[PDB]
Amino acid sequence: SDSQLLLEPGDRSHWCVVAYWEEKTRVGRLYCVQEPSLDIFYDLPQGNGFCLGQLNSDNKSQLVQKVRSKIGCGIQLTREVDGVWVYNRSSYPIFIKSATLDNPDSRTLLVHKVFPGFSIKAFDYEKAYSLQRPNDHEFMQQPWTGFTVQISFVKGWGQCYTRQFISSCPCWLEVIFNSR
Amino acid sequence: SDSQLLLEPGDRSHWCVVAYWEEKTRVGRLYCVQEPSLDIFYDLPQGNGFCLGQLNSDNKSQLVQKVRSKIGCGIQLTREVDGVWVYNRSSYPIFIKSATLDNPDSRTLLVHKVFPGFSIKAFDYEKAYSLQRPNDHEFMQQPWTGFTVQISFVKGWGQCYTRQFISSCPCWLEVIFNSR
Ligand SMILES: [Cl-]
Ligand SMILES: [Cl-]
Ligand SMILES: [Cl-]
Ligand SMILES: [Cl-]
Ligand SMILES: [Cl-]
């Protein structure tokens, strides 16, 4: 046409970027978010946004298939006046690690459980802007942890769970937040 | 606010995301790249791209100020049919860590020096697609390392340098790559 052929340049206005993982395998392209709210869900009639059921995956594991069938309506991420909220719209708990959810003086970040229908503030811009975790050596060596949130469907990880690391979880998300 | 519309919250077409760092401080908003090539520079005549001199950094270190100016014309990042290439357009070496630059059987990833005027394939889609590093425990625990490239201007880090960690470098980039 006239405007249908041109490719626009990039921008600084996408407020987060989402990566979907199955265990150690990244599934599908990254989803870069512009509008203030996004559903992340399994099948097309179940939300407006990032559809995970459409992603072609090489991981055919039975456990991954079972968790995928439990994602259902998934989660919603929404920018609000006081930060970014994650709402659990699905019928199973989700588990979240975010640097802005924890006491800045702790030695390690915790994984937080969010029951179906409950919400949690995934990201706080003011706290992230000034965040130092001086007692967390891994954090100081990997400061991008300050703006990357990890979310697992159905299965928890870390202390008091079978899986020590998030990359053992069947279905999980990496959410990278812009500073904004 | 008054008319119905067909919302798409985001897109999959930005092929990498660039974060600029000064030591342990993230500086400026993330840049989501859609154009085939991106110039990243401190000062480039009639330059159009990701200008690091315009950002208003909180890092007031004199070393950071000196290195920032040395970036000069910076680097060029180009997405091509055969992968993503980095061209060093500055007067100083740059230093790059990328999982697709290394022997997959090694224990830890190396930092690679790129002279002024030289190029390197910073990211290879097919090598990354299902890259496994079975002797690298950190990589298996943090598989997103396989899609993220770190680039430092002027100053090296790692094995052969006083700086052990990337977050000790005065001026560096985190580049998060999308899949093909
Ligand atoms: Cl912009
Ligand atoms: Cl484990
Ligand atoms: Cl798209
Ligand atoms: Cl080298
Ligand atoms: Cl160091």
From Swiss-Prot, chains A, B:
Homology family: Belongs to the dwarfin/SMAD family.
Domain MH2: residue ranges: 15-180
Phosphoserine: residues carrying this PTM: S3
Full-protein positions shown: 247 to 426 of 426
Subunit: Interacts with COPS5. Interacts with STAMBP. Interacts with PPP1R15A. Interacts with NEDD4L. Interacts with RNF111, AXIN1 and AXIN2. Interacts with ACVR1B, SMURF1, SMURF2 and TGFBR1; SMAD7 recruits SMURF1 and SMURF2 to the TGF-beta receptor and regulates its degradation. Interacts with WWP1. Interacts with PDPK1 (via PH domain). Ubiquitinated by WWP1. Interacts with TSC22D1/TSC-22; the interaction requires TGF-beta and the interaction is inhibited by TGFBR1.
Protein name: Mothers against decapentaplegic homolog 7
Subcellular location: Nucleus; Cytoplasm
Tissues expressed in: Ubiquitous in various organs, with higher levels in brain and kidney.
Modification comment: Phosphorylation on Ser-3 does not affect its stability, nuclear localization or inhibitory function in TGFB signaling; however it affects its ability to regulate transcription. Phosphorylated by PDPK1. Ubiquitinated by WWP1. Polyubiquitinated by RNF111, which is enhanced by AXIN1 and promotes proteasomal degradation. In response to TGF-beta, ubiquitinated by SMURF1; which promotes its degradation. Ubiquitinated by ARK2C, promoting proteasomal degradation, leading to enhance the BMP-Smad signaling.
Free-text function comment from the UniProt entry: Antagonist of signaling by TGF-beta (transforming growth factor) type 1 receptor superfamily members; has been shown to inhibit TGF-beta (Transforming growth factor) and activin signaling by associating with their receptors thus preventing SMAD2 access. Functions as an adapter to recruit SMURF2 to the TGF-beta receptor complex. Also acts by recruiting the PPP1R15A-PP1 complex to TGFBR1, which promotes its dephosphorylation. Positively regulates PDPK1 kinase activity by stimulating its dissociation from the 14-3-3 protein YWHAQ which acts as a negative regulator.
Top-level lineage group: Eukaryota
